[PDB]
Design a protein around this nucleic acid. Structure first.
Lengths: 480, 56, 388, 122, 490
DNA sequence: AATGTTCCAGCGGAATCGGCAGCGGG
DNA sequence: CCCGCTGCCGATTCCGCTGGAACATT
């Protein structure tokens, strides 16, 4: 089982009519992968880890020697897929075998012709550059000529079948993002490549779009914009155009079947809403509706990024109105009243009303500079609703446990932006964050993070306004 | 080796009579002469053109 | 409106002065030239429907000279003139550099990388061509096949025979052009020689299977030479014809011997009325000769005319996007209004009367089209937009 | 013979096999009558579409073994041509008839039986 | 069937007299069968170079097969025809060939029976392709192989029925006892002679059938019909010349690439425009601008009414005629009404004029669907299929202008003499058989450049007229035609 | 200086077909 | 909120055909 199947794999290389023997080797590779994945003991996991990668004989050297084999593709493809599985099956100690894998990845890409193996020879290499994002054990991967060749392999005939090209754009972006240190100079060429190709995809009265290419271009551009920001004040052309492309990639189609361009466009928007500063105040209404739409999409990963993009959008426009809210009276009123629309409307949703409350809390602070009274007009109806909902009524049996952290972050946010505390609800304030504590184990990850955000946020808010109410942080911690 | 075409175009008010219900004969003449000249100029031949205007 | 293969004046488009002007001009130009002048007259609608503005300006193709050889003795010097062949755009869309607009400021290349671990470049002079033969390749290279290739024995218009029963049917012409052989100059006896040949070939149903090569370099083609049938000249038209490898046999299931597709006589007469509604031919002026409604063999190519006007617009106006296709083009490429008006009804009679146009699950959308309490009661009593 | 949905042809075959077994156990003169019909319906399967042929033969032979004697040859010609579950159906079809095939060793060996016992499927 | 390759297993007898000259000084029938198989491979590897071929000899002392039955030697298993396999099969020609077969396999044995056909079955069985047709060519002279044993005859009969069950058709090509036919014998049940058809006249062809298009023909605006547009006449031409390395003999994968924006570097699709410089002015467009300006319609035919089959003359054609035929795929019921108006266009002698647009973004081009009735007989000669026939109509400058200034009349007496000349010159034109000189010579050259047989065959230029033959058939009269009106006379 | 052949790129039936979602299952 | 097939649905490949641009003889 261990190191003997690999031995048979290298033994069956020279057998004549390596077609049935090809299937036997492929089955052996499948069994090896199944065995290694089934392995649960970390000690034997590292043992087989060292076992598979050996210079004298192994699958790595097999791929390095089976290069000139047309029929050895499905076996090569199976080995590459197993390598992709392994690179995340185990930890971050691939190092002694990393660089050669990367090298062989390029080899198993730069010679193999079938796109069924050109994809894994990009999946494995993207995985390698993601799991060694740290500079250590990584400068052995020369980003220089890697970028050079994977950027020169798209200056040629319209050959590569729009899926390998998708992964190529993803990898160019990732090179822009992981290790941004050597490619300080050629990122302009990569930006111009991304914008030009995305242009051709979104402006043509010919040729129904290569949607995988559009998704790859957008996600790669997102990654490249990390560490290579173009804020919307220095060069006011490329940021306009990137945001225009993001709009068109998230413009609401009446009837589209595949959701891959909206996913990557929404993830770009979520990551980099701050990047598009002044472009993000013109059609904000339509952005609001489209973000609610894709929050209500009933997909699996389209909502996961639509909600993040909506959150970042509201966050950025809140941080924006909170600067010069003189001509932002109308926009402020619109946002807060649409949050009222989300929260007073009778909807059977869960993550819907958890948007209005958080937007309420974010937009609270910009209200202190328009009224200085609505920080108190709010935060009272907010605590009053908290008391009605999850202090007295259906305190035990209901579904209203999901939407407590939103209340708590909103409360803390308006709390910081509110001087001369009403000081009659503070007992209920502490009685509310204690009971946010009480219900932490009946939640899920990625709100447990946000619930911890709410708890530290309330703490850091009430604790920064003199010792009188910082005396209640002791009481709340004690009661929790 | 080369041929010369010398067109003539009437432009007068009667030629440019306001639309009797379909379209103007003068503008039809304009369309046809534009077809002729565009094909001649895009054929790169040495078939010269001399244009004159009457009813001016 | 623009051109419709039909009438010119809408209801009454003539006046007395216009009629007399037409009379005097036609009389003067007839006396100057003759009946050919009256033959050469058109409107602004068909001159946009025809190439009539382009006459006697372009030149004859080539008087390609060869000889009709029957056996080794019956020789007839001939000049073939090239007849129908597809025309094409004579300019290449030249690649340039973006935003600097210079043709020389770009240069492509071609590098023959090997199937090795990288782009292990090799030079041009160390690459010879192969050929597929089985599972491997044959190092044929170049000079070798330029020696042991077929040799053509020069340009040859030698007749391979004749045939009465026309197995040479139009569904087998295989060509890319049509040739038309008349005569030569220089004491035209060969004129009447081949004229005798074709006046023998025309009256009785025989054809002329012939061998033809353009020159020494060109490959030889066996074709059929149907005899010319016109009054002002008498030619021997020539057309290429398949070789044993060219023509394919495709078994298609029969229709007369088909059951589940059996058409009812109701359908037959329905499409009878459909055909007679949209017939493009008729008889008139008591001449017992058919007229040519929608004669698709005289109107120009919309391709290069639309290209001409598109490039005109983009050349004068470097900013505006591509224009739309003219209305007169779309009138070129549409049947006359009379047939459509006579047509709408049997069209719908078929629409209902025939089985359904069932399956429709296809879309070809372009990129630009896919990404571009008491207080409340007191208030109610006080104010109300509606009433009652 | 309705090859567009699984249950129509598969269950027609299975109920037909049940009917055939019943009219065999009842010694009546009707079994051969549509035994020939079902045989013919399989014969149109043998050489235009193989997977439906083996599915329907397995379904008839789950309850009626004595209809593969006149199909064993076919199944062997198809036995090394299947890799998925169709090979499992093929081998069950051969298994319903083995106790009486004259040698069956040569046909199996010719078809790589030893090498196919070594696969992973249970 | 499309992804379906037909196949041949060659079962060549070598027992007692097919091996031996048998008092005949022309060719031993074992060598005759070897020549036959050689011809088959030559024909296929260049006409049908995707099929499966196999040669197996039986009745031999040695025995190679998957199951190890005696006397059966599977020379080659089913695989694509190669130059190497025909070279390997070449070494059994002549007396030296007979002795080479002896020293490697060796004639003469208790030649086995049905087991032999058994091997053929397995050779078909143990392949992983899709076989449209399966057949076994059986080259033998022994035609009464059971004057002594009756059990083996019955076992052979059972196994032959066993083989015809699974779609395997025996068709034995026929060696001879005297050299020609005298053996009128009785294996008519085992089978479902003239090997000369199978030795020479398969020199070069190609095999396929495919649709070239699946378009809609639209009548008014919404009653669209599902038509396919095949071509029955192609102009096949010499295969592509792959580039090989001079030393390693490998197909280098060339890569083209543009650069040098005055900085060298590397240009990218969007870094370039397209231009034309007419007269003294350049015009600049985007790639998509040019690709779009040649857009008029979605693919498919639009009916433009009907016209008689007397107005479209025959001196107008532009392209090889296509052939449309209804497939009931895009819209159902297409075949029914398609046949309906085909019958109507027949009886009315009318044809469906249309505006063809074959591909997505292509200029329109006027076409005419000339109706076409099929043809068949008791012999089932599918000479023509039933449907329409897309004749492409020239537009306006396709039609060139000839001088037309030729007017000299003729003498209607010698015209009959020329008539008689062409009446003795006539013969059946053809339905087939005009092998392409250049292509045939090319295939010869590839053969005798990968078969090593240093003399390349000489393609007989069938196209070249036999001028001397028809001159001696003519007689000495055309000289009188020359002297009649145009004597040399200085 | 025109024309036919060679060459290259781009679009398409057709076959696989993997897998993208979507209706059953616990 | 999960798990299993079961279509049908995009892309892939590999032929194949056409168009367009190159390229060598007179």
């Amino acid at each position: 089982g261990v190191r003997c199947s690999l031995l048979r794999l290298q033994e069956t290389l020279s057998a004549a009519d390596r077609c049935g023997a090809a299937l036997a080797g492929h089955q052996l590779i499948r069994g090896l992968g199944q065995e290694c994945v089934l392995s649960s003991s970390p000690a034997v996991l590292a043992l087989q880890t060292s076992l598979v990668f050996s210079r004298d004989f192994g699958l790595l050297v097999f791929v390095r020697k089976s290069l000139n084999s047309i029929e050895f593709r499905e076996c090569r493809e199976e080995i590459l897929k197993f390598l992709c599985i392994f690179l995340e099956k185990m930890g971050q100690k691939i190092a002694p075998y990393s660089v050669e894998i990367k090298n062989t990845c390029t080899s198993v890409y730069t010679k193999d012709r079938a796109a069924k193996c050109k994809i894994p020879a990009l999946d494995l290499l993207i995985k390698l550059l993601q799991t060694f994002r740290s500079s250590r054990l990584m400068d052995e991967f020369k980003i220089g000529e890697l970028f050079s060749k994977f950027y020169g392999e798209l200056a040629l005939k319209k050959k590569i079948p729009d899926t390998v090209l998708e992964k190529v754009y993803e990898l160019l972006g990732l090179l822009g993002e992981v290790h941004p240190s050597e490619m300080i100079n050629n990122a302009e060429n990569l930006f111009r490549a991304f914008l030009g190709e995305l242009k051709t995809q979104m402006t043509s009265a010919v040729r129904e779009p290569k949607l995988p290419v559009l998704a790859g271009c957008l996600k790669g551009l997102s990654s490249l914009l990390c560490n290579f920001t173009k804020s919307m004040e220095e060069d006011p052309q490329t940021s306009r155009e990137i945001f225009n492309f993001v709009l068109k990639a998230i413009r609401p189609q009446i009837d589209l079947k595949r959701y891959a361009v909206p996913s990557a466009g929404l993830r770009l928007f979520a990551l980099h809403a701050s990047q598009f500063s002044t472009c993000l105040l013109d059609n904000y209404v339509s952005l609001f509706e489209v973000l609610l739409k894709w929050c209500a999409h009933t997909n699996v990963e389209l909502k996961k990024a639509a909600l993040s993009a909506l959150e970042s959008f509201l966050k950025q426009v809140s941080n924006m109105v909170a600067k010069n809210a003189e001509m932002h009276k109308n926009k402020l009123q619109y946002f807060m009243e649409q949050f009222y629309g989300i929260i007073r409307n009778v909807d059977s949703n869960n993550k819907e009303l958890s948007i209005a409350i958080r937007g309420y809390g974010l937009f609270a602070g910009p209200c202190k500079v328009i009224n200085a009274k609505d920080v108190d007009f709010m935060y009272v109806e907010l605590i009053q609703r908290c008391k009605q909902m999850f202090l007295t009524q259906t305190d035990t049996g209901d579904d209203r446990v999901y939407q407590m952290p939103s209340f708590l972050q909103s409360v803390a946010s308006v709390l910081l932006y509110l001087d001369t505390v009403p000081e009659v609800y503070t007992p209920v304030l502490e009685h509310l964050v204690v009971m946010q504590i009480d219900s932490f184990p009946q939640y899920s990850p990625k709100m447990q993070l946000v619930c911890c955000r709410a708890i530290v946020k309330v703490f850091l808010a009430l604790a920064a306004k003199g010792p009188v109410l910082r005396n209640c942080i002791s009481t709340v911690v004690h009661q929790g | 080796n080369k041929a010369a075409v010398v067109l003539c175009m009437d432009v007068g008010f009667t030629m440019s009579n306001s639309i009797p219900g379909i379209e103007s004969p003068f503008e039809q003449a304009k369309k046809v002469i534009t077809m002729f000249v565009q094909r001649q100029v895009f054929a790169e031949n040495k078939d010269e053109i001399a244009l004159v205007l009457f009813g001016t | 409106r623009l051109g419709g293969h039909g009438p010119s004046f809408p209801l009454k488009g003539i006046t007395e002065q216009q009629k007399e002007g037409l009379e005097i001009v036609k009389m003067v130009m007839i006396s100057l030239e003759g009946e050919d002048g009256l033959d050469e007259i058109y409107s602004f609608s068909e001159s946009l429907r025809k190439l009539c503005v382009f006459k006697k300006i372009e030149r004859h193709s080539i008087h390609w000279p060869c000889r009709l050889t029957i056996g080794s003795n019956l020789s007839i010097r001939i000049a073939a003139y090239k007849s129908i062949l597809q025309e094409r755009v004579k300019k290449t869309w030249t690649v340039v550099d973006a935003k600097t607009l210079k043709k020389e400021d770009i240069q492509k290349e071609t590098v023959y990388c090997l199937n090795d671990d990288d782009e292990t470049e090799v030079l041009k002079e160390d690459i010879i061509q192969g050929f597929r033969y089985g599972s491997d390749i044959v190092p044929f290279s170049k000079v070798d096949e330029e020696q042991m290739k077929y040799k053509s024995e020069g340009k040859c218009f030698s007749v391979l025979g004749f045939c009465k029963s026309s197995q040479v049917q139009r569904r087998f012409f295989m060509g890319n052009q049509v040739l038309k052989v008349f005569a030569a100059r220089d004491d035209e006896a060969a004129a009447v020689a081949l004229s005798s040949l074709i006046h023998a070939l025309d009256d009785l149903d025989m054809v002329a299977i012939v061998r033809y090569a353009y020159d020494k370099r060109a490959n030889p083609q066996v074709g059929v030479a149907f005899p010319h049938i016109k009054h002002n000249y008498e030619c021997l038209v020539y057309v290429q014809l398949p070789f044993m490898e060219d023509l394919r046999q495709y078994m298609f299931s029969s229709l007369k011997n088909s059951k589940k597709y059996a058409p009812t006589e109701a359908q037959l007469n329905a499409v009878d009325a459909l055909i007679d509604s949209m017939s493009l031919a008729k008889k008139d002026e008591k001449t017992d000769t058919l007229e040519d409604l929608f004669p698709t063999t005289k109107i120009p190519n919309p391709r290069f005319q639309r290209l001409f006007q598109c490039l005109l617009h983009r050349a004068l106006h470097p900013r505006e996007p591509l224009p739309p296709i003219q209305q007169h083009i779309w009138n070129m490429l549409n049947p006359p209004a009379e047939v459509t008006t006579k047509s709408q009804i049997p069209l719908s009679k078929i629409k209902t009367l025939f089985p359904l146009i069932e399956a429709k699950k296809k879309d070809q959308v372009t990129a630009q089209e896919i990404f571009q309490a008491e207080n409340f009661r007191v208030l109610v009593k006080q104010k109300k937009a509606s009433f009652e | 013979s309705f090859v567009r949905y699984k249950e129509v042809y598969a269950a027609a075959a299975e109920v037909l096999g049940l009917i055939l077994r019943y009219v065999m156990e009842r010694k009546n003169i009707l079994e051969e009558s549509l035994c020939e019909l079902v045989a013919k319906q399989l014969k149109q399967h043998q050489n235009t579409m193989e997977d439906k042929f083996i599915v329907c033969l397995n379904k008839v032979t789950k309850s009626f073994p004595p209809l593969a004697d006149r199909f064993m040859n076919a199944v062997f010609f198809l036995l090394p041509k299947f890799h998925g579950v169709l090979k499992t159906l093929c081998l069950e079809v051969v298994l319903c008839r083995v106790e009486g095939m004259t040698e069956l060793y040569f046909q199996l060996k010719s078809k790589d039986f030893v090498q196919v016992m070594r696969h992973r499927d249970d | 069937k499309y992804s379906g390759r037909d196949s041949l297993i060659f079962l060549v007898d070598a027992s007692k007299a097919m091996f031996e000259s048998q008092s005949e000084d022309e060719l031993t029938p074992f060598d005759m069968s070897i020549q036959c198989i050689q011809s088959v491979y030559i024909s296929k590897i260049i006409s049908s170079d995707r099929d499966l071929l196999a040669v197996v000899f039986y009745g031999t002392e040695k025995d190679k097969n998957s199951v190890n039955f005696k006397n059966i030697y599977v020379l080659q298993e089913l695989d694509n025809p190669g130059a190497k396999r025909i070279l390997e099969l070449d070494q059994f020609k002549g007396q030296q060939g007979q002795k080479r077969f002896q020293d490697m396999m060796g004639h003469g044995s208790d030649y086995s029976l049905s087991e032999v056909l058994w091997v053929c079955a397995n050779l078909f069985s143990d392949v992983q392709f899709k076989m449209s047709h399966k057949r076994i060519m059986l080259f033998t002279n022994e035609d009464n192989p059971h004057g002594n044993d009756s059990a083996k005859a019955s076992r052979a009969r059972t196994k032959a029925g066993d083989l015809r069950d699974t779609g395997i058709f025996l068709d034995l090509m026929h060696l001879k006892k005297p050299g020609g036919f005298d053996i009128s014998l009785f294996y008519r049940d085992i089978i479902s002679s003239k090997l000369e058809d199978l030795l020479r006249k398969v020199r070069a062809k190609e095999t396929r059938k495919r649709a070239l298009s699946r378009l809609k023909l639209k009548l008014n605006k919404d009653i669209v019909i599902s038509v396919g547009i095949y071509n029955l006449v192609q102009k096949a031409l010499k295969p592509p010349p792959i580039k090989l390395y001079r030393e390693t003999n490998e197909p280098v994968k060339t890569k083209t690439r543009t650069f040098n924006t005055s900085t060298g570097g590397l240009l990218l699709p969007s870094d370039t425009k397209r231009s034309q410089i007419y007269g003294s002015r350049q015009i600049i467009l985007e790639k998509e601008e040019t690709e779009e300006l040649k857009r008029f319609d979605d693919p498919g035919l639009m009916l433009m009414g009907f016209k008689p089959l007397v107005l479209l003359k025959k001196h107008h054609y532009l392209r090889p005629s296509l052939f449309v035929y209804p497939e009931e795929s895009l819209v159902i019921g297409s075949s029914t009404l398609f046949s309906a108006l085909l019958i109507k266009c027949l009886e009315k002698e009318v044809a469906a004029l249309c505006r063809y647009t074959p591909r997505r973004n292509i200029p329109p081009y006027f076409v005419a669907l000339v109706p076409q009735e099929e043809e068949l007989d008791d012999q089932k000669i599918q000479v023509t299929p039933p449907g329409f026939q897309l004749v492409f109509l020239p537009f306006a400058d396709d039609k060139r202008k000839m001088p037309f200034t030729e007017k000299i009349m003729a003498t209607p007496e010698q015209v009959g003499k020329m008539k008689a000349i062409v009446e003795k010159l006539r013969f059946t034109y053809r339905s087939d058989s005009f092998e392409n000189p250049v292509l045939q010579q090319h295939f010869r050259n590839l053969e005798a450049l990968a078969l090593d047989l240093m003399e390349p065959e000489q393609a007989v230029d069938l196209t070249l007229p036999k001028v001397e033959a028809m001159n001696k058939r003519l007689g000495s009269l055309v000289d009188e035609f020359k002297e009649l009106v145009y004597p040399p006379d200085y």
